[PDB]
Design a protein around this ligand. Sequence first.
Ligand SMILES: *[C@@H]1O[C@H](CO)[C@@H](O[C@@H]2O[C@H](CO)[C@@H](O[C@@H]3O[C@H](CO)[C@@H](O)[C@H](O)[C@@H]3O)[C@H](O)[C@H]2NC(C)=O)[C@H](O)[C@H]1NC(C)=O
Lengths: 98, 220, 8
Amino acid sequence: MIPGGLSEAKPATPEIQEIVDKVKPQLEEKTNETYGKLEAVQYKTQVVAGTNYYIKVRAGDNKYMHLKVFKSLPGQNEDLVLTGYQVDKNKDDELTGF
Amino acid sequence: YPPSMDWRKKGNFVSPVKNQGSCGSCWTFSTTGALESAVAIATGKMLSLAEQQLVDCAQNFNNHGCQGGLPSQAFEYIRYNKGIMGEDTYPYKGQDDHCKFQPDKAIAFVKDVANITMNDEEAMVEAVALYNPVSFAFEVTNDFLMYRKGIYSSTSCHKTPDKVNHAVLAVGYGEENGIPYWIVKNSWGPQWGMNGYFLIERGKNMCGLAACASYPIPLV
Amino acid sequence: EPQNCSAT
Ligand SMILES: *[C@@H]1O[C@H](CO)[C@@H](O[C@@H]2O[C@H](CO)[C@@H](O[C@@H]3O[C@H](CO)[C@@H](O)[C@H](O)[C@@H]3O)[C@H](O)[C@H]2NC(C)=O)[C@H](O)[C@H]1NC(C)=O
């Protein structure tokens, strides 16, 4: 790890899914689509003046999406904002910054 | 070396706290701080250096814009690149842009880079007592994120190179209630912790506190 | 030598 890289990737955990579920509405307000169940599968983290989340969500069936959410510092208030997303992603696909 | 040491108190040697936003450019703030202090410590002229520059150009020194870096390598960047300009001419944007470096604009320079030996926390104290605020990178945790005051200890973090993930600036040291700590400047704004600053357990290499620390020697 | 923290 470099002082600001993304972490190595780890399996998705129950909180990641919370984040994706809390976030799903924003994907939709931006792509004006409606996704079935968006299952978190993998994620990476990155410390900034908060934390940036790089999650690999299975939102179709044999199709993967890559979301990027920013979780604020525990003192600056506010919630998880979907900062970006990458359409059409393979299951094996490395999660990267953006 | 005195038991205490506050670079901010000695004089006008520490530039305002500031944040890096959602951009992973903490290392650049780590970088800009060491160098603004030094020049201040040598010339008494207080200047703010553009972190954007390091974000847009310190590429050849193993840095990676908003995706990572390290003060030491960035320090080398400014030596070889002949300088760094301020903000008023290279403002903060928090995102990867393309290099707008303009030579005739550089207002701070670097002659040498003093890399504290690996895991040598003591040498870090030496450098801070006699020379200049030091830049280091520790291991942050959601744990650390809630910091509000006091000496931040930690049992969850490991020490080694790998999980080191957040450069900051050691600006002093001391001890309270028998616990020796490091006074540190963070790059998250005057709202978090002790107004951008946080105190951390000293003497045990807390969260890989001295795995890759260094300070600059300004050409002035 | 090159400080070990920087890679990527
Ligand atoms: C202190 O730590 C830094 C960070 O790793 C080390 O920086 C390295 O310094 C060398 C020169 O000492 C740099 O080499 C130069 O490369 C540039 C760019 O390609 C070129 O203009 C020169 O021809 C020269 O080869 C090297 O880039 C730099 N590496 C990084 C990642 O910054 C430095 O060596 C360390 N010092 C000690 C004593 O350990």
